């Protein structure tokens, strides 16, 4: 009884870029995790911390929904203690990650003809991002000694680049809409289970 709908995230119309990922704070409602487990419409389903089947008997305080789309070959880079391009420059996971990440192929609704320019991913940064960090920045990157702000050329690099997603792409170069659920535990009581 008294369900709250979660279809505005998994069945959402449109996502955002990886460096502009959204967060959806969820509390004081009812989860239906067995349905999304038995959906069997996702190519990747790794649920860290707990067993994916018998997790339904335990519920936590808060769940934050994070949504982004990546290429089909960096799907292994979303993991605790894992390096890579987007792992170290777009989305960093904590080492003691107990969350739950879901990924599936999404070329047939987002990869139109000629590629889509609506998604941007960060290339250059001084160091690796901290775990659970967002960078909402359009700053041109400085890759040398001369200042790089309002100027282009050598070492004045734009850190954000688009994605080329043609319908004739191979299995390793397809847009995968990736959603991850972060589980929170604190002195506040658990709220979301049923």
């Amino acid at each position, epitope marked *: 009884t008294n369900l709250c709908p979660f279809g505005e995230v998994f069945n959402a119309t449109r996502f955002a870029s990886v460096y502009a990922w959204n967060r959806k704070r969820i509390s004081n409602c009812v989860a239906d995790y067995s349905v999304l487990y038995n959906s069997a419409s996702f190519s990747t389903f790794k649920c860290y911390g707990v067993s994916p089947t018998k997790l339904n008997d335990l519920c936590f305080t808060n769940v934050y929904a994070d949504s982004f789309v990546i290429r089909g070959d960096e799907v292994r880079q979303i993991a605790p203690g894992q*390096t890579g*391009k987007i792992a*170290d420059y777009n989305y960093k996971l904590p080492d003691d990650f107990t969350g739950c990440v879901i990924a599936w192929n999404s070329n047939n609704l987002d990869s139109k003809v000629g590629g889509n320019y609506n998604y941007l991913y960060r*290339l*250059f940064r*001084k160091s*690796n991002l901290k775990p659970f960090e967002r960078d909402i920045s359009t700053e041109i990157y400085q*890759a040398g000694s001369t200042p790089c702000n309002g100027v282009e050329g050598f*070492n004045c690099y734009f850190p954000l680049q688009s994605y080329g997603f043609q319908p004739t792409n191979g299995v390793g170069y397809q847009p995968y809409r990736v959603v991850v659920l972060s589980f929170e535990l604190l002195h506040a009581p658990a709220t979301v289970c049923g």
Partner: nanobody
Amino acid sequence: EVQLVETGGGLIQPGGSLRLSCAVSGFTVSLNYMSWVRQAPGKGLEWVSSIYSGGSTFYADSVKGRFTISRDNSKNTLYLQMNSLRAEDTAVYYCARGLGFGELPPFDFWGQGTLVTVSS
């Protein structure tokens, strides 16, 4: 201008070790995208390893673990401490800077080349 220094060729044996160096001008080794590539007779422009600007490193299949990547921030130069090699490492290794990505990252620069002589 960007200059490149490839030195470290010499009489080497498999299982042993030596040291390799790459020197650059303009940008800095600890902040740009560098990638190691090699050329051998009977072999193409074979990618070796790469270092990321955030501190992470990545190698190929046959060179991971044995080799290590090294760099000095203030010296603006890069190092390859070749350790515990094999006989099949006879090649010419080139230092380069990867711009983007692909099968190999696009290198706007090529090293001057040093030929590894694994011979006893």
